[PDB]
């Protein structure tokens, strides 16, 4: 819709297909269309456009979970939207931001606002045997979401849904 | 002087790649980094090609070995996989995980991973139909949630907080 997201979505694109470092004005005037001063007016320093990305990426989360969510107050309900939207194989440019985003306090915390609401605290986890129960979710979670990249055989439709259907039935 | 020149090389592009980035490397960028003459890298690998698998075949050694060196009765599917997880636990580095993303792009990096993921990792035979395959399975994707967690997560897991969750995912294997 705005200008800003366009450009942010075509060099989310750009990364997956190219990479995070060609991605420069030069590259992202070519593939919007629109010239270097335009992109500039939106996006001052090549730190704020990759900062832009992770952002617009967090908030496409936060807005699933809020969207499919069927309790916001119950932390086992907001588990379950977790396991669901991290069942699907994450998009390579997204993984390739999520990797890049160590790089800077900055990035980091673009993320941090979605984990912070949506993914289980980990204080106490060594004294406490329910955090751990409710991580242990979250983490076969997380392997569910990255598992194509790091195994070498692609998870059929049928055996991914068997997987989040054990991944759910471990939530306490 | 403790390895051969050619596993210094390998190890010095893949510590530029943590560096840098995969993208930037190449016989200029590893020339640099390891002060040899490009006619030096060239002697032993011919390709970028080779250099890459080279790294691959490296990476995936050094998993085996570990797993051989951890791993007691060894034909034991259990054993291997308690053996597994441990060796999961620890975060993969950056250059690791950059480079199994990228193995798909030519069969002979995926080859190089191939004999020790098919020793050691459990296949998803019949996964829909087989629930034993499920609860094994699911151990096998949460340590690969503790693998990969400081590259997609914004927070890194301190050492006693992985140590927690490690002992509580073997907890989760069939016994
Ligand atoms: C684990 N991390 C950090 C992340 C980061 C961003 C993400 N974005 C999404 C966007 C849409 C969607 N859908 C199912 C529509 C699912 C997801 S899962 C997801 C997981
Ligand atoms: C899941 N995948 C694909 C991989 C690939 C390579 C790996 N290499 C290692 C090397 C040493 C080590 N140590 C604990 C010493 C642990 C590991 S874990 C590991 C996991
Ligand atoms: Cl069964």
Known sequence: TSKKEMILRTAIDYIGEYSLETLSYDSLAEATGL???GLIYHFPSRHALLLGMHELLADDWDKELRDITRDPEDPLERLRAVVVTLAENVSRPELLLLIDAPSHPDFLNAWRTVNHQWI???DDLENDAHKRAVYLVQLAADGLFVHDYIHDDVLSKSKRQ?????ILELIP
């Not at 068997?162 to 054990?166: H, I, K, N, P, R």
């Open 120 to 122: 289980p605290d980990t």
């Open 162 to 166: 068997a997987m989040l259907e054990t």
């Open 35 to 37: 010239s270097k001063s």
